[PDB]
Amino acid sequence: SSGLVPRGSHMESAIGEHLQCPRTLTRRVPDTYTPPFPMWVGRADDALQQVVMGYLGVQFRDEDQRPAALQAMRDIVAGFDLPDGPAHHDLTHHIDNQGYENLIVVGYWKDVSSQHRWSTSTPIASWWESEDRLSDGLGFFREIVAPRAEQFETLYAFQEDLPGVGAVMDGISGEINEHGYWGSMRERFPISQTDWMQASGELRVIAGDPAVGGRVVVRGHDNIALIRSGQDWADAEADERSLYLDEILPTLQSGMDFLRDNGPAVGCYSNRFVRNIDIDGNFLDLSYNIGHWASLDQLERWSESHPTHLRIFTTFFRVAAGLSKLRLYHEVSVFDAADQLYEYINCHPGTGMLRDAVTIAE
Amino acid sequence: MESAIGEHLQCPRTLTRRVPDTYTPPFPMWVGRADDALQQVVMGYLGVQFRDEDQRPAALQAMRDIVAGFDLPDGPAHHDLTHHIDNQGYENLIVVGYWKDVSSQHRWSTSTPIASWWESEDRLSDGLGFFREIVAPRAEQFETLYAFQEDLPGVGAVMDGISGEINEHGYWGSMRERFPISQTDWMQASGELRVIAGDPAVGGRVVVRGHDNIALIRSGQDWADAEADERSLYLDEILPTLQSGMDFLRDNGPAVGCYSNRFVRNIDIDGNFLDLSYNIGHWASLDQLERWSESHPTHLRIFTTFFRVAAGLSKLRLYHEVSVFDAADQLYEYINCHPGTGMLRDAVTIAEH
Numbered sequence: 001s002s003g004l005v006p007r008g009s010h011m012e013s014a015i016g017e018h019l020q021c022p023r024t025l026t027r028r029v030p031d032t033y034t035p036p037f038p039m040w041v042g043r044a045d046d047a048l049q050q051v052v053m054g055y056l057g058v059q060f061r062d063e064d065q066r067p068a069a070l071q072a073m074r075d076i077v078a079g080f081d082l083p084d085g086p087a088h089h090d091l092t093h094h095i096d097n098q099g100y101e102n103l104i105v106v107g108y109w110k111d112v113s114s115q116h117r118w119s120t121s122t123p124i125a126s127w128w129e130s131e132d133r134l135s136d137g138l139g140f141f142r143e144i145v146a147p148r149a150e151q152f153e154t155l156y157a158f159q160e161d162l163p164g165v166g167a168v169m170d171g172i173s174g175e176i177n178e179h180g181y182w183g184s185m186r187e188r189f190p191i192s193q194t195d196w197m198q199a200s201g202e203l204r205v206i207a208g209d210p211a212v213g214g215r216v217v218v219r220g221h222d223n224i225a226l227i228r229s230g231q232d233w234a235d236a237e238a239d240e241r242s243l244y245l246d247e248i249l250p251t252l253q254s255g256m257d258f259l260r261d262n263g264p265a266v267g268c269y270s271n272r273f274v275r276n277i278d279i280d281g282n283f284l285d286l287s288y289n290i291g292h293w294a295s296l297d298q299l300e301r302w303s304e305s306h307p308t309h310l311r312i313f314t315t316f317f318r319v320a321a322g323l324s325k326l327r328l329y330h331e332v333s334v335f336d337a338a339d340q341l342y343e344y345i346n347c348h349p350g351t352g353m354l355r356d357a358v359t360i361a362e
Numbered sequence: 363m364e365s366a367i368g369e370h371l372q373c374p375r376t377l378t379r380r381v382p383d384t385y386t387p388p389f390p391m392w393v394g395r396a397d398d399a400l401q402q403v404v405m406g407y408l409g410v411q412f413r414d415e416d417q418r419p420a421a422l423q424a425m426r427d428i429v430a431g432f433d434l435p436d437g438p439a440h441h442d443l444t445h446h447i448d449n450q451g452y453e454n455l456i457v458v459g460y461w462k463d464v465s466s467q468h469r470w471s472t473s474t475p476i477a478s479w480w481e482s483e484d485r486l487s488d489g490l491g492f493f494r495e496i497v498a499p500r501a502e503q504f505e506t507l508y509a510f511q512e513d514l515p516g517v518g519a520v521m522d523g524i525s526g527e528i529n530e531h532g533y534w535g536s537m538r539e540r541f542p543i544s545q546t547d548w549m550q551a552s553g554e555l556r557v558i559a560g561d562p563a564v565g566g567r568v569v570v571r572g573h574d575n576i577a578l579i580r581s582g583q584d585w586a587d588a589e590a591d592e593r594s595l596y597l598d599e600i601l602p603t604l605q606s607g608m609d610f611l612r613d614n615g616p617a618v619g620c621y622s623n624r625f626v627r628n629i630d631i632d633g634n635f636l637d638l639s640y641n642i643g644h645w646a647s648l649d650q651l652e653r654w655s656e657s658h659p660t661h662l663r664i665f666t667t668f669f670r671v672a673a674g675l676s677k678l679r680l681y682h683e684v685s686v687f688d689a690a691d692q693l694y695e696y697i698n699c700h701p702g703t704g705m706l707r708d709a710v711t712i713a714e715h
């Protein structure tokens with residue numbers, strides 16, 4: 001039956017038991033398929049219906065704005081302690097291709113109604129709506145997206161202390177079957193059992209004007225995809241730190257720069273390559289991509305063809321056997337139009353979903 | 363757009379593709395077409411092996427003898443000739459013949475001039491190694507892919523013509539989808555590659571039986587029409603990456619599920635080289651071949667190098683054919699070959715399975 005070390009059809013599935021159904025869209029590997037290295041996925045029971053991933057940002061241009069920016073980031077984080085705040089968060093920094101610095105606090109909620117109560121609560125809404133946000137001279141944004149349980153997948157190359165959305169799930173799976181081949185990401189989405197997750201519609205400005213600053217609201221469209229793909233080398237030994245910093249990162253950086261600067265050509269609305277920071281703005285040894293894509297298909301096409309991702313993909317297969325403390329993972333999600341809110345205050349026109357959004361009158 | 367799967371071979375699907383029906387490939391490719399008359403083909407690879415330079419005249423005469431046999435009634439519809447030196451330093455002349463049906467190849471093999479030659483005691487006293495690796499995929503059990511639309515080599519030479527631009531290519535997993543049987547069947551491998559007569563370690567006559575869904579790839583390169591600048595791109599940029607991958611599979615086959623990897627150059631009847639080459643690769647399963655092509659750094663380096671230089675290409679002809687077979691539709695026979703030859707290397711003895 002099932003051995004000590006299960007293989008093929010005896011291995012666990014990425015798809016939670018309560019979300020399984022007979023596949024009308026079938027897998028691309030035979031029943032005997034057994035991956036060459038272990039990967040695990042986040043588990044949650046049926047109580048997790050729909051999560052919220054809220055990326056809350058503070059943007060600035062000049063050195064003399066850094067104190068005000070850090071103060072604002074700290075105020076956002078303080079707001080997380082209030083009732084209905086997110087169950088997990090982390091803080092990051094990056095400089096965008098227009099030279100603006102961006103601090104982003106990402107929060108994860110286990111329930112949509114909870115996030116909505118938090119956002120509407122007086123302390124939070126008064127801060128977000130305040131005229132102070134305009135007089136601050138800083139840019140702010142909220143890119144808040146809510147995939148149902150069937151609409152996201154996770155993959156971790158480790159088992160303990162899961163970052164991102166894994167932190168708000170119940171626990172970790174055993175070693176899963178649906179990984180190690182192109183097309184496996186799609187297969188890991190429970191909705192993939194029956195649905196092609198095809199994009200339709202257009203990113204559209206529904207309030208304000210990206211070109212002139214002030215307050216701007218962009219509506220998403222069906223099956224925009226969001227990838228968070230991360231690297232953590234903080235506790236690794238010197239040799240694994242070198243593997244990452246010297247052998248992986250320069251190529252990863254090249255690929256991230258490519259998506260950042262060639263987005264419209266490949267279907268990437270926004271690409272950010274961010275470094276974790278502490279509450280004081282100082283760098284930590286963790287990083288990740290935050291990538292918003294016009295479709296899951298376009299993300300698939302890029303990942304399986306661009307030389308940068310192919311090189312690092314192949315490095316991982318090589319070092320997989322010996323990996324001890326270097327931590328790599330991703331989470332990918334798709335969303336209905338109604339389950340996405342992209343709001344900007346005094347951000348430059350290239351920020352996030354402002355860049356490719358169809359203006360209020362085309 | 364046109365489908366890789368012939369109209370008569372399209373059926374109600376129980377297994378789906380990995381892309382939606384709206385997928386559009388980023389560059390054109392074409393496939394071989396044949397109607398319902400082509401039911402099952404035979405690919406017969408007939409080899410002559412030798413170690414020492416003084417055996418070359420006898421080896422070449424043997425090759426000419428085999429080719430003359432191809433001219434008899436029920437001989438193959440198409441053939442080509444190749445040379446390579448294997449990782450044991452032996453030279454190998456291989457004549458591949460393609461037949462459009464199983465019965466004709468059987469009539470041919472059992473016909474007195476052919477059977478008498480293969481069964482002769484002379485084969486044991488020639489000092490040469492001889493082999494026959496003969497496999498017969500049904501129409502639903504092979505796929506082709508050509509980056510050109512004329513004079514198809516290999517199995518394409520025995521099909522009826524060429525398609526228009528096809529939908530099912532340009533993403534990993536597209537090869538599987540070009541097999542008509544993928545509409546309903548995983549082409550899962552089962553069974554063992556097994557010695558059923560003789561002992562590879564001892565020589566003489568050895569017979570190996572295949573297993574269900576062994577896969578065979580012939581992936582080819584033809585630069586015979588290239589002018590100087592394009593020859594440089596192929597020989598100086600592409601070929602070193604191809605060479606690296608071929609060396610890898612030749613020398614690390616068990617690790618990735620490749621039973622046999624040959625990288626061969628076409629020759630004319632005199633044994634002189636032509637500017638065409640191909641891989642002949644036998645694999646333990648179609649999915650092991652898929653894993654190598656899509657995740658091994660060797661093929662990925664070939665892939666990326668190709669796209670880096672592609673804008674300077676025009677006359678270079680690249681193609682492949684891949685087949686899977688039932689156990690019964692494979693025959694691997696060796697006479698006085700070294701123990702690493704073809705299916706002899708990895709085949710297990712009767713008591714080892």
Ligand code: HEM
Pocket residue numbers: 039155178179180181182183184185186227229230231248252289291299300303309312313314316317328
């Ligand atoms: C340290 C950096 C990275 C490494 C070493 C790496 C490596 C890999 C590996 C080994 C896989 C296959 C996982 C499995 O199924 O077992 C994979 C999948 C994937 N990666 Fe990355 N990756 C990195 C960063 C990224 C980034 C920043 C992106 C953003 C576009 C990306 C996009 C993808 C996608 C879309 C897949 C799924 C492919 C599929 O299953 O169809 N990766 N990556």
Ligand code: HEM
Pocket residue numbers: 391530531532533534535536537538579581583600604641643651652655656661664665668680
């Ligand atoms: C210079 C020689 C080669 C070049 C430039 C090259 C390039 C490529 C390209 C561009 C593709 C994707 C084709 C498409 O779908 O449009 C491909 C697919 C493939 N190649 Fe190669 N290749 C070469 C040699 C080989 C060889 C010798 C092998 C033998 C194992 C091989 C095995 C494969 C396989 C199995 C696929 C199918 C992948 C799939 O669709 O799942 N290739 N190759």
